[PDB]
Structures are given as C-alpha cells and as structure tokens.
Amino acid sequence: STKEKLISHVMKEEPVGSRSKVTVVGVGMVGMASAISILLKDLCDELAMVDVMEDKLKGEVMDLQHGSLFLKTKIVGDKDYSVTANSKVVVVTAGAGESRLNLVQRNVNIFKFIIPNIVKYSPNCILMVVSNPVDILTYVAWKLSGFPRHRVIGSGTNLDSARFRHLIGEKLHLHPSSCHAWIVGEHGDSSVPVWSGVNVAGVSLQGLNPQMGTEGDGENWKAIHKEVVDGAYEVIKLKGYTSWAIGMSVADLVESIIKNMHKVHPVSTLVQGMHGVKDEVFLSVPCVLGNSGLTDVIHMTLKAEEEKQLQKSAETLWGVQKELTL
Amino acid sequence: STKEKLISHVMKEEPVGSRSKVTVVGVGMVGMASAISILLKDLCDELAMVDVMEDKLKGEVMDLQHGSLFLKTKIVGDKDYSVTANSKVVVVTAGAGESRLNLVQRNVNIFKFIIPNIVKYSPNCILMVVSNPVDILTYVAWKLSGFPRHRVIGSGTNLDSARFRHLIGEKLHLHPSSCHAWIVGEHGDSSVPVWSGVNVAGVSLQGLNPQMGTEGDGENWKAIHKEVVDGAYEVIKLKGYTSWAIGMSVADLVESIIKNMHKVHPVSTLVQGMHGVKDEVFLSVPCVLGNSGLTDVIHMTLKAEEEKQLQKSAETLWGVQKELTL
Amino acid sequence: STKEKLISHVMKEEPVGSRSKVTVVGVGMVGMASAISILLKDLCDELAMVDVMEDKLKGEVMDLQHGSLFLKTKIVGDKDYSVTANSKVVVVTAGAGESRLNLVQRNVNIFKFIIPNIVKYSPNCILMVVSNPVDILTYVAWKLSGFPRHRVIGSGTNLDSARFRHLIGEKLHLHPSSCHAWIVGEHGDSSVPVWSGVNVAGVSLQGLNPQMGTEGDGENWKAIHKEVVDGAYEVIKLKGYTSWAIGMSVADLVESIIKNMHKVHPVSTLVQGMHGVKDEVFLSVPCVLGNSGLTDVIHMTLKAEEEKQLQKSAETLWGVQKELTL
Amino acid sequence: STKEKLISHVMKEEPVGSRSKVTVVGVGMVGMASAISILLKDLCDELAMVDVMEDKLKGEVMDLQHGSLFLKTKIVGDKDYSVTANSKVVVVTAGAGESRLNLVQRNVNIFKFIIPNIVKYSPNCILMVVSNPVDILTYVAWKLSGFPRHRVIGSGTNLDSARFRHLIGEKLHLHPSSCHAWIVGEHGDSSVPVWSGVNVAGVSLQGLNPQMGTEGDGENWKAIHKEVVDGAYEVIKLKGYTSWAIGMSVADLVESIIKNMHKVHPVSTLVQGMHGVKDEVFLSVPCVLGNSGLTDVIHMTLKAEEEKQLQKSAETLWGVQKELTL
C-alpha cells in the first residue's frame, strides 16, 4: 500500500501511550465548553468524551476530530468507559415541580452508574466534579469512589469568584486579574463574599469603604455578590443554557492540575474541622492544586459571622446528605 | 466613592480605542464556536457580537463576559450595529422542500440588511464570509458592499482541506500538519481534491500510488474526499448541528489576517481569468492572507480535467447568480 | 521567474502595514531577552531592533530571522532609526571607580542621541524605559521627548515585585501568581515592600504575623525583600550578566499595553502630588496599563513611615536630576 | 510560623512528582536559548539544567527562577546529575588549528562523562542530541548509552530546513509555514536540498522551474541552500555566537515529543538500509516524533544522485567513526 511504501516503523517496543489524558464525562453544552476550552489551550495529549447519549456523543466527537489540524490533542469518544482509560483528570458534568432532596437523589443515581466505571479504567485519576449541586455531589463522588480526599475535587466557587472579579473589574475599569476577591462556602445563594480580602494591588477596598457589603454601604457592594450568584439564572433566562464561563473555569482548573502549578483556587473539598464545621461536608475554600491533586487548603481568617454562615450551610448540606441512598 | 479614593486618571487625551477589533455576525453555534475559538487564542483586543435575536445574543455575550478573567479581550454584543464599529475583521455567519435558487435568495435577503450596517460602522473592515453557500454568498457580500476585491473573502475550502488533512493523517498515523493536501473550487460536492499536491514531507503520494483518486485505485483515495464533503451532513445527522471544526478554522483564518502573516489558505475569492474561468464568480484557490486582507493568489498547475471542473462550477454558480435580486 | 508563474498580486492599493509594531532599542542581553520573550509569546506583528553596534545587531537580527518558522512576527533590525518607524511600543534598554552623578550623565548622554530619533519615526509611540537607573531615566526620556505623561513609562519595580512573589511562593510552596505582594518607590536599595498588602487569597500575612518586616519578626521577612533587591547583583556575580527575568517582565508589560488589558502593574511614573511627594520625579506605584499607555494610577493606603521613604527617595532622585545636563 | 497558620496539608501520600520533565545539558547560549524557548512556550512541568561550570549554571538558573511568575514550569539546576532525575527528554548541547578527527574525539570525551550520568537518573529518557557535529554525535550517544534506536535522536537538519523555508518565504513574500522544502542527509556542507519536494500549496516549484538547483538555473536556487548552510558561520562572524534559531527549533522538536503529536521532522537517526546506505551511521530524513520517541521514518523518493550523496556522506561519517575511542 501507499502507507508502507512511505513509512517504516523503527520502534520495537509498544508505545508508552498518552500521559496527560483528560476525560470529560457528559456532552451537554457544559462538557463541550469544557472540552473545547481544554483543547484550545493545549492542556493535554488526549481528550476523551463519554455520555449515555451515543449519537449526540459521536457527533460532538466527530466534529472536534475534524479540527485536529489546529490542535495538538488526540480526540476520542465512546459510550463504553474503556475509552476513558488512563485519564489523569476526569471532569464530571452529567446532570438533572420537585423537591431538592429528590432532584439530588436523581443526580446521585446518575453518579452511581458513572463513578464505578471511571474508577475501573482510571484507578489513579483525579475527579473534578462540576455538576450542580456541586458541594454535595463532590461528596457523593468521594465516598462513592473510595479515593483519598485529595483526588476528589469540586469546582465549587471558582467561576463565581472569577465572575465576581470580572464584575469588580467593570466597576473599576481594571482587568479582572488585577481585582482580587474571594467567594467561599456553599456554592449558590448562601456563598460568602469575603469583603476583607477584596483588594486591588494589596489595597484593601473595605479599607476605603468600611461599610462594604452591609446595609450601611453607600455603594451596594452586596448587590455585586448577588449578581454573581444570579449569574447562571440570568443567562439561562436569556439563551436557554449556560456553558462558556464554566468551560473556561474548568480548563483553568485543569491546567493547574496537569502542569502541577501549586496554584490557589477556591474549590469544593472536605472542610470538616475548618472554621467550626462539625459535619463531613464539602465547601469552597482556597486550595492548592497540582498534579497530585488537591494538596493543601488555606485557612482564611474569617470573622465570626462568616464562620457561622459556613456552619449553617454544612448543616443544610448534611441535612440532605443523610437522607441520600448511596 | 471607592473607585475615586483608589484611582486617579492621569491621561488628558481620549483613549485610542481597540485596534484588533473583530466582530462576529450571528450567534448560532457557528458564531459562538468562531467567537470562543478567537477568544481562547488571544487574537484580538475586542470581540463584538451581533444578531437580530436580541435575547439569545445578550445571553451568549453575558456568558462570555463572565469568563473575562481567563481572557484578554473586551467583549461586547448588541442588536444595534454601532456596537460593531471599528472592526478589523467581520466574520459573517448568519444563515437559512425548496429550490436552491430560492434558498439562496433568502440568504441574500439576509445579507441585504446586514452588509450595509457593517459597511456603515466599519468602512475599512475586511469581510470574511462564512455562511453557506459560501462561494456565491462571498460574491453577494462583495458587490453588495462596494469593497475592493481584497477586502472580501470567503472561507471556501479551508476547513475541508483541514478535514482532508486530518483524515489523511489518521490513515497514515501522522499529525494533520505533516500531511499536505488541497481541495479547491466550489465548496461542497463539486470540490477538487488535487491529488498531485498530496504529499508528506515533499514526497508525492500520487507518486507512490499513480491511480490515486481514480477508478483504478486499489485504496479508494476518492472516498476520503467524499468523506470530507459529507462531513457536515454526517455530524448534523448525529448531534443536530455543526460548529466546532468551523469555528477553529475561522480563528485560524482570522489569526493569519490580524497578525499579518502572509500565510497561504485555500479560501473563496474572485477567480475570473484563472484556469479558464470566464464568469465573475468566487471559488477557493490558495490565497495569501495578511492584515491588508487577501493580497495574492497562487496559480496551481492544474491538469485539464481539473480546470474543467472549475469552469463547470462557475457556470453553475453563475447560473444562480444571474437569477439573484441584489 | 518562478514567483511570477506562481503568484498574482490581486490588491490594487498599498498594504496597511504593521499595526502592533514594537521596537527594542539595544542588543545587549537585556534587549535580546526582551525580544525573544516578545516573539515567543506572539505579542506583535513586527519586532524591530536598533543599536549603534551595527555588526552585533545584524548578527542578533539575522539569527532571529532564521527562526521565522516557529514565529508569527516580522523581524527587522538596523542602525538607522527609520527601521523603527511606526512602532506602538519602544522598549529602551541601552546602558552604561566613578560617581553616581556622572554614571547618570553618561546614560543621559546616551538617551540624548536615542530619544530624538525615536520620536522622529514614532511620534505617537509609547516609551517603556528599562535601563538603570530606571526612575531618573524614565524622567529624562519624558522631558527629553516631549510626550504626554501617559506615554512615558518606566519598568520600575515590576520584575522585583515578581521576584518578591516568586520568593514568597518558594517559602510557602505556592505558585507565584497565588502570592500577592507589592514593592514600590525608588527601584533598588530604597524600595518599599508593602507588608500590609502581602496576602494569599485575600488573607493578610502581616495579619498572621504582626511583626512582618520589623526587627521583632521571628521569620525575617525583611531579608526576603533584601534578597529581591540583591537579585541582579547575585546573578551577575555568578554568570557575569542579567537578562532572563527582565526580558520576561518586559514582555509581560508589553502584552498588557498592546492588548489593551487595563491591567495593574507596579511601574515607574510621575508621582508628584502622591503621598506627599513634592518634586517632579518618577517612582513605582500600581498603574493601569492599556494601548493608550499608562492611563491610571492606584493610591495605596500607605502608612506614614512608607510615605516618608518615598519622599526621601524623591529628594535623593531630585538631588541628582538638578545636576543633569538635559 | 506563618506558613502553618495559613496552610494545612491534606494529602497523606507522597506527591507523584513532575511528569513532563525536560533537562537541558549545557548552559552556553545554545542551552539557554533552548531553555528559555521551552519555558516561554509552556512545554513541560519541570526544566532542569546541568553543566560542569557550576557558577555559570547557578547564575542562569537563578535568573530563570526569578521569572517564575510569568511561567508555568518548576526550574532546577545543579552540577550533580541527580537533579536531572526522571526527565522525559534530555537535550544535550555541550560542545568543543586542529583536525576534525581530533575535534570529534574531544567532543566524544565530553559525551563519555555526560551520558552515563544521564542514563543513571533517567533510564527511560529520550535523548535529543544537539551539539556539532550532530550526526556522528547522536551515534556516539546511542551506542554509548545502550538505548533502543528510537530513544536516541539527533536534531539533524531541523533548523536548516526551517531556515530554508524562511529564506524561500522571503523570496516569495509568503510566511515560512506556507513554503515547504526539505534538506536531508549529513548536516552542514554536504546536505541535500530536495528540489522535487519544494512546493507552495502542493504546487511543485521545480515543476515551474525545471532547472531549479542546477547550473542551468536562471535564478540560482542552489545559492539559497548554500546560504542555509553558511548560516551559523555568517551569524557568528557577526555577533560572535549562534543560539536563537536553534533554541526555537529545539523547543519545536521537544513539543512534538512531549505532546505526542506524531509530527514529521527532518532529524538525525539510524539510516542503515535506507537509500543504499550500508554503514551504521546517522543522517537526517523525515521522521515521526511522539512521546515514545522517534517511532517511524519516511522514505522519500530520492533520485539516484541524491541517494549517492547520502552514501558518500555515510562513508565520510563512518570514516571518522571507526577511528573513535568510545
């Protein structure tokens, strides 16, 4: 044949195979936005996709294969989980009148099928849980997977902190990366915007505006936080989905892991014994991320009323968790 | 306020404003895939979006604004075309039992509204036409815009040539960029896969397989070409749309223009007087692209039966064009 | 000829020419490290070099031209300053028993030849002064150039702040970008490490260690600062030059300008009227950078003894300046 | 301490350690240009340096450590080779009236110390030999290392082919990546510019100019080749060294290996049994590169007088080799 006339294999032993392999579970818009952001940034040597909707999957994966010229990653995708084998990272994005309990249980049924097959072909992978709710669901994945605490991570408040920095940048006319601000705790309505850490170039903003975040504030910084959390709702109440920002925040998280940067990200993780948290639950706090997974946590010096909010959420979170069939 | 306590403006004169501004017309999946690929690669200092579907637009643009932390481009989007002002590139992606004539006329009605508003706020912009059919539609945009030939470009056979190189890479187990092959002419069913230029490292493949592309071929290289053109149909017959590969091929085209690389891309452009083409029509041939737009065309040495295919398409293309209300 | 047989020019009007053009004045190791970092990161569409040592220049520029395949920038270099024409940014790196006064005057003689030729071919360029001393020398360039305050920038404490964040990252085992800390004022021995702004994820370090930076400190954070400033001396006392870190910090500064990011960098600029500074001198404070140049300055809330250090430096700086022949 | 108050380690087991580790042997300008290009492009998670000149080394490595903020790689450097442990790639750059025989033997003495220590801490590393002469020296490293053919690669004609494409781009006013041309065989004076493969967009140039490369050529294409090989000499006869282009060509080679791209590069490798080559020697031919190393070779269809040149070089190369003390 032509291939033979043209090429002679000069390697005796079997190829070592991919080494930065990432798998994205789920091909809804959140998976594809995660996948295309990962590919566009050259973060891994192989990207695998997986979902129960076989046709939808094959169309996504065929489409991305067709751009292989502008990329640097091998792309695979299949319904069988042997396609995900030997991943370093597995980003889980599969998802959901009705009760929160019960909406949670369904999402947990979904995880019951997925996790075992992931563990089966990627025993040493790091799980990065992305589907909502993320705090409880990272927990589910963690006990429902057997992995050591450090290999099970929830995306937590990463995007919201990003979104919070973006909104603060627009108010100030500064690029987002020059505005520093952190949102922690339970992702969504009950998250904690830590006003004492909001600074530009180490200059405390609350320092310049002591009422920042309170009812005495003449500039309604609290509404910015509310805007961050109403984020997904406003976008979906507009184009009927959310994806882009999340996908970019996923690739950001993944780059920190695969390049072993020891970078600090607000992500969801086991917080028992932090800030008075009694129960075994997951919440976002600043965490160190590398290729070992989540290696370290940062202890922010939180005021009493902020530790309190974190304790109340853990109770609400643990309320639901005790009701779960795992 | 806090901003004032913190920041003092030390520039007397008005800001010079964005200088690499790109606008993507249309927020279907092709526009967003073009937009997110452009943003992920840091290609411009401002990306603007525009579409008649105001709500859908605002949701897309709000979503991408929310990732501004991981990006380096200012993002705008509005229904009014003053938002597109001062673009360097305008990528047009808006689109369509029924006759091809009439499906074309509708797409041309769409262009009649769009083009004038684009020309109005970006008199010196380069148009890159992407919606199908692309050959006739780049033509429409060109006379319907008044721009000099070089500022009006059709994406032509860029992605298909890419897809062709990808498929050839999978057969050979080589990265796509090491397999060189060109598809020219009218985009779609009647395109020309130039077998004499198919090489790896300057080694002619047809040289090793003289029957390449013909009925005497023992390896059916012709079917690879057919696969490239059945591409969009197979993907859509699977996930119900196409986007990813096109978006990446758009950003590739845009990078070559904005960085002024004088790079060679197979794109659609005026071919009258090339290869015996009599009529005023657009087809893909290798073209030089820079920040001036499309500066040069390459004359491939085509065999007679390949010049013939290009002439027949131009007649079919000019058949439809003469019927158009412009 | 072959070119003609192969290519036909299809553009009637003159090319628009380069639009992100950067010029690096000086081909010592600092210029080349600036140039290669700028090129490796795709920041501009044309990089020009210039230096009085014609042969050395031509060898540097020929060498970088030879890698044009892995790059995306046009590369020029000449002794005549018409080669620098139409730059957006001009990074000035040309440089020097003896008195500081007199070492300064020589560097100022050097600037007297260079600046006028730069202004001549790039009337609207932004100057980024890099050679030491940088605070006085940015000043020299500014009055000796006629440009509005915002188009004249000194690299100030950018690298030192970077180096400070790197050293803090090694002590903490965190990536540099997760450790935030600022050094301001007069670059070198008398710079100010602002301990109140040193934080990881908004968590004040001085908050955890109240003695940070003082003689009561049980961890000698002051020595870290001293290490940052002894930086260039220790490296040169080892390999006989410094370049790499500076070059990377230059490209960082340049990217913020050319992509119009409105990002915050500690750079040297006019500080009269800031923090009790009476005299017309330049020092590093957090500054907003975009494609307009230096648009905004940040007012850090400095303690009295830190405003005092800045005032004393300005007097020492203005001591020398009043002695200069400009 | 502060670190403790701030950070709690939540990982029980030992970190997995770096996974894309590259080591550059040698801190002359070729090593640093290789190192800074590798770092600027985010290609590995750890870059190690090594050289017998301890002080020079420590100054280079300290300098690059100081830019860790703008980078994503951990940087190490030491005289002891345990610092190079667990590298995926080891780029060897250490180097040399007098005879070629004897200049070769000295370079081979140098390799005798280096190779064993490399093999000792990186038993499964891929060697990429860069120092001149490269063809014989890759050979030396190969038998003098014990590695399987595929883990021992010479940089061969990579840069020269790049330089050849750059020069062809300047003549044609096309970006280098759109001009395709290959130089093979023994690197330097006796290399083979394969005129039949010189094309733009699959269009044979020799096709348009049948005399290309010969004494009947009206455009002296042969002189372009001579210019490529006189490259290093002309640059050094100007600035007193060469580095930049080589460093960029090294990072290009390294990216293809670490991302497992299966990309085609003209590199030096065992050619016995190719094109009539009898002897055990190394020359450049198009080779497939991935994370397994050099997996495949391409058989170019060379005319008889081009196979002859390759055979004559192998004899000249094997002339010297038989004289070596290994």
From Swiss-Prot, chains A, B, C, D:
InterPro entries, A to Z: L-lactate/malate_DH, L-lactate_DH, L-lactate_DH_AS, Lactate/malate_DH_C, Lactate/malate_DH_N, Lactate_DH/Glyco_Ohase_4_C, NAD(P)-bd_dom_sf
GO molecular function, one term: L-lactate dehydrogenase activity
Name of one Pfam family that matches: Ldh_1_C
Keyword Translocase part of the UniProt annotation: no
Positions annotated to bind NAD(+): 28-56, 132
UniProt subcellular location: Cytoplasm
GO CC term (a single one): cytoplasm
Signal sequence range: none
Stated name of the protein: L-lactate dehydrogenase A chain
Function summary: Interconverts simultaneously and stereospecifically pyruvate and lactate with concomitant interconversion of NADH and NAD(+).
Assigned keywords, A-Z: Cytoplasm, NAD, Oxidoreductase
Gene3D superfamilies: Lactate dehydrogenase/glycoside hydrolase, family 4, C-terminal, NAD(P)-binding Rossmann-like Domain
GO BP: lactate metabolic process
Major localization class: cytoplasm
Catalysed reactions listed for this entry: (S)-lactate + NAD(+) = pyruvate + NADH + H(+)
Keyword Cytoplasm annotated: yes
Family assignment from sequence similarity: Belongs to the LDH/MDH superfamily. LDH family.
Lineage top rank: taxon: Eukaryota
Pathway: Fermentation; pyruvate fermentation to lactate; (S)-lactate from pyruvate: step 1/1
Binding site for substrate: 100, 132, 163, 242
CDD domains, per the entry: LDH_1
Oligomer status and interactors: Homotetramer.
Catalytic residue list: 187
EC number: 1.1.1.27
PANTHER family from the UniProt entry: L-2-HYDROXYCARBOXYLATE DEHYDROGENASE (NAD(P)(+)), L-LACTATE DEHYDROGENASE A CHAIN
